């Protein structure tokens, strides 16, 4: 998979347009293959058009949390869902807590077209 199709698969859900059921993360972490080998401790889904998300790569350039400088912060807050493992999880069967939030996202961008390949953070 290209890094861009992997970002869409791990972090984009343009159809929700917010996580209204708290069963959402349990059934989207599985749906997007994030529980195939182990429990991914944390992951964020973005509920905006892909045009709104890809357009973040031309907005405020900020520093990636690992030191790199090709990360970008969104102009307006975006609808996101934080998936977090509960205290009761473990990998046969992964259990996740769902939190709907409206935050700005930060992504690392690459390529032509210049698009998000890593999800860095929320503010």
């Amino acid at each position, epitope marked *: 998979e290209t890094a861009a199709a992997k970002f869409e698969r791990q972090h984009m859900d343009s159809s929700t347009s917010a996580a209204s059921s708290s069963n959402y993360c349990n059934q989207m972490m599985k749906s997007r293959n994030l529980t195939k080998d182990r429990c991914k401790p944390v992951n964020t889904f973005v509920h905006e058009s892909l045009a709104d998300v890809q357009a973040v790569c031309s907005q405020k350039n900020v520093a990636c949390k690992n030191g790199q*400088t090709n990360c970008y912060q969104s102009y307006s807050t975006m609808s996101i869902t934080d998936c977090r493992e509960t205290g009761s999880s473990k990998y046969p069967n992964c259990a996740y807590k769902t939190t709907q939030a409206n935050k700005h996202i930060i992504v690392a961008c690459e390529g032509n077209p210049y698009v998000p390949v890593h999800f860095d953070a929320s503010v």
Partner: nanobody, 121 residues
Framework: QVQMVESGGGLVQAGGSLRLSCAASGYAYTYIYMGWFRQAPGKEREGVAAMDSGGGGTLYADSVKGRMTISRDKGKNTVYLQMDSLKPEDTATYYC??????????????WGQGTQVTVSS
């Protein structure tokens, strides 16, 4: 829309000197990293020099350190390449790029149209 604006290239004798200027206008913030890449006829595109918005993070390609000097207006979206002692192998189109990391080609999403530099022997 972010206009990339380059100038300073053209024809120059071997052992000669040139100064490339590049400015990104219409960007509401400050590209942390900007730099120069170059491509020749046939040769694949390669990195030349790169510098961060503080004045640090300075990096040159192993083929041009000592002959070439990057600089930026601190905090501003401008980048300059002073080239001295020029060889015929420096002949190439020089591209200004903004918003990536070091000389990592895939990480910049802003590229200028390119400034032709030709160095006769």
């Amino acid at each position: 829309q972010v206009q990339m604006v380059e100038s300073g290239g053209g024809l120059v004798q071997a052992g000669g000197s040139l100064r490339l200027s590049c400015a990104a206008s219409g960007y509401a913030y400050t590209y942390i990293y900007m730099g120069w890449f170059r491509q020749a006829p046939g040769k694949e595109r390669e990195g030349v020099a790169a510098m961060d918005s503080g004045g640090g993070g300075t990096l040159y390609a192993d083929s041009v350190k000592g002959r070439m000097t990057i600089s930026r207006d601190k905090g501003k979206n401008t980048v300059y390449l002073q080239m001295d002692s020029l060889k015929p192998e420096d002949t190439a189109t020089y591209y200004c790029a903004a918003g990536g990391y070091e000389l990592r080609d895939r990480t910049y999403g802003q590229w200028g149209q390119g400034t032709q530099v030709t160095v006769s022997s």
